[PDB]
Amino acid sequence: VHWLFTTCGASGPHGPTQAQCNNAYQNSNLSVEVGSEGPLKGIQIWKVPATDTYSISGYGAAGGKGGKNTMMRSHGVSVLGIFNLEKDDMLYILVGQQGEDACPSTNQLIQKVCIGENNVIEEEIRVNRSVHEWAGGGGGGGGATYVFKMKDGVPVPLIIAAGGGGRAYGAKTDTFHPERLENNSSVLGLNGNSGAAGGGGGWNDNTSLLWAGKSLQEGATGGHSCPQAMKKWGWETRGGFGGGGGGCSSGGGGGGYIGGNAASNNDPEMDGEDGVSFISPLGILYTPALKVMEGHGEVNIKHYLN
């Protein structure tokens, strides 16, 4: 007996509708309520059937790829906890969505960049030393996966499994930074830093920049693409639902409890950072967090024996 929560077929910066999850879950014994407006839009609400110890395995989404798809993407993080839950408790489950890949594109000039038939960016890096005009090509951050409850009206996080940062346009490494896992509620769950690309959204912040991933309590919408990339040629690479940041040349930050930082400038080699994961101090971590998801996130819940 288990319950498997998916994106219900949704992708991109916005989460699924009620009808998408109803369709996705028609063959299983899983019923959820999905809000249609406000900060809870796209978050799946599930009723705990019995008082028991449960395992809640959360899996964040991967970040997007950069200016070539011949690079590894930053995989989303797994966080596996056990929790005491009471019958009829309501769990709020946001399944993170993959950060958008920069390529391929519908635009003629951006596709030529994608297959290496347009060297404007390389030329700008050569003649000039930075990318100020031909911005774009970095991937969006992946959304984190959030599992939380309500306590006297205030949201309380249980599991947050971080999203991967987007790859920069010019990324050429297959290595990543270690997983950060927080478990102290006193540590503020803030957005990551935004620069040209968007920082990842955290758990609870105030987001003003269109390209920044929104924090969970703001509704966790993935960030828009960076303004210069839109202004120059419409290169739209967005973050995934769950707080992913938009991509510029640099990659967007992954969502999390604390969002991943994007580079302060538009460095075409600077990946977005992965977000920071979280486990409630009242849960128990079953095994170390690992980066494992190449696409969208997911949540698996079951009765926990032992």
UniProtKB/Swiss-Prot annotation:
Phosphorylated at tyrosine residues by autocatalysis, which activates kinase activity. In cells not stimulated by a ligand, receptor protein tyrosine phosphatase beta and zeta complex (PTPRB/PTPRZ1) dephosphorylates ALK at the sites in ALK that are undergoing autophosphorylation through autoactivation. Glycans are attached at residues 29, 128, 183-184, 206, 306. Homodimer; homodimerizes following heparin- and ligand-binding. Interacts with CBL, IRS1, PIK3R1 and PLCG1. Interacts with FRS2 and SHC1. Interacts with PTN and MDK. Disulfide bonds join 8-21, 103-114, 226-248. It is linked to A chromosomal aberration involving ALK is found in a form of non-Hodgkin lymphoma. Translocation t(2;5)(p23;q35) with NPM1. The resulting chimeric NPM1-ALK protein homodimerize and the kinase becomes constitutively activated. The constitutively active fusion proteins are responsible for 5-10% of non-Hodgkin lymphomas. A chromosomal aberration involving ALK is associated with inflammatory myofibroblastic tumors (IMTs). Translocation t(2;11)(p23;p15) with CARS; translocation t(2;4)(p23;q21) with SEC31A. Belongs to the protein kinase superfamily. Tyr protein kinase family. Insulin receptor subfamily. This is ALK tyrosine kinase receptor. It is found in: Cell membrane. The EGF-like region drives the cytokine specificity for ALKAL2. The heparin-binding region binds heparin glycosaminoglycan. Heparin-binding is required for ALKAL2-driven activation. It comes from Homo sapiens (Human). Neuronal receptor tyrosine kinase that is essentially and transiently expressed in specific regions of the central and peripheral nervous systems and plays an important role in the genesis and differentiation of the nervous system. Also acts as a key thinness protein involved in the resistance to weight gain: in hypothalamic neurons, controls energy expenditure acting as a negative regulator of white adipose tissue lipolysis and sympathetic tone to fine-tune energy homeostasis. Expressed in brain and CNS. Also expressed in the small intestine and testis, but not in normal lymphoid cells. Changing residue 179 to A: Slightly decreased autophosphorylation. Decreased autophosphorylation and subsequent activation.
